[PDB]
Symmetry: C3
Subunit: 115 residues, 3 copies
C-alpha cells in the first residue's frame, strides 16, 4: 500500500492493524477532546476502508479513541480523535503509538425507497 509520511509502522501478517504514531508531543487537559496528527497520507486499495481503533496500551490510561472511518477516497493526513476521560492532564510524546489502522472491505449499494 502507498503511503506518505512516517507516522505509521509495517505490521506482522498475524496482526490486524498498523500502529499509528503521534506526529508531535500533545497535552490533553482533563475531559479535553483533541485531533492528534499522525503525519501520514494513505492510498487505500479500491474496495476497502481504514478503521481507526484504539490500542489497549493507551486505553488503559484513560484515553479513548473515537471511532475513525478513513474513506477509500481520502487523500489528506490521518488524524486521531482522542478524549481524556481521566481527572488529570496527560501527555503524549512525539512518535508514541496512539492507535491502530485496520483495512477492511466495504460494500457499495444504491438505496431504493421500498417497503
Amino acid at each position: 500500500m502507498i503511503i506518505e509520511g512516517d507516522g505509521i509502522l509495517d505490521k506482522r501478517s498475524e496482526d490486524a492493524g498498523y500502529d499509528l504514531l503521534a506526529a508531535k508531543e500533545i497535552h490533553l487537559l482533563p475531559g479535553e477532546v483533541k485531533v492528534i496528527p499522525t503525519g501520514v497520507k494513505l492510498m487505500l486499495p479500491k474496495g476497502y476502508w481504514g478503521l481507526i481503533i484504539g490500542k489497549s496500551s493507551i486505553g488503559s490510561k484513560g484515553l479513548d479513541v473515537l471511532g475513525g472511518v478513513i474513506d477509500e477516497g481520502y487523500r489528506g493526513e490521518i488524524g486521531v480523535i482522542m478524549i481524556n476521560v481521566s481527572r488529570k492532564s496527560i501527555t503524549l510524546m512525539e512518535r508514541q503509538k496512539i492507535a491502530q489502522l485496520i483495512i477492511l472491505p466495504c460494500k457499495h449499494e444504491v438505496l431504493e425507497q421500498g417497503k
Copy 2:
C-alpha cells in the same frame, strides 16, 4: 439495498458509509446516553451486517456511538446510541448528520469446545 424513510443518505463509491440524520432534536447533558431515532428501516443484503460509527465532526465534540451493530436479521427503526462524554451539554438538531452506516461481511462459525 431496500430502505424506508429519509434519515439516511446515499453515498459515493469512494465513500465507506451512508450518513445518518437525526429524526428529531436531541439534548444531551454531560455523561448522558440517549438513543437518537433516524426513522430508517432497511433490508441488509444476504451475508452482511451494518456497523454504525460516529462522524469526525460529532466525535470531535465528545460524542461517541455505543454498540452500533445492525444485524442482518433486524427490520426495526434504526436508532443511534449516543453518549456525551464531554464536560458540557450539547444539542443535536433535526436532520443533522450524526453517524455513518458501513456495510460489512458476516462470518458464521460453529463454536467447538477444544484445545487452543
Copy 3:
C-alpha cells in the same frame, strides 16, 4: 472455530456476533479502568480478526468499553477493557453479558513510500 472456555455463546446466522460474558465479579472504583476477564481463548480462522463491541446496556450504566481488537495470532484469554466514568463504584456480576465479538476479514500489505 475452536474455543476454549465458558465466556462465549453460539449465535444465530442472522446475528453478526457472539456474546461475551464476565468471567468473574469485578469492582470498578470511580474513575478506575479495568480489564474484565471473559475466560475464553480463540483460534480465529486464518485471515480474520475479532472485533469486540461493548454492550449498549453497560455503557448507559456509567461504564465505557475501550479498544477491542483480537489479533489472528493472539492465543491468550480475551479480556474487555473498561473505565468507570461515574461517581460511585459499579460491580459487574459473573456470567453477565459485557460485549459482542464479531469475526471480520483482514487485509495485509507492505507499506510503500510513494505519493498520494
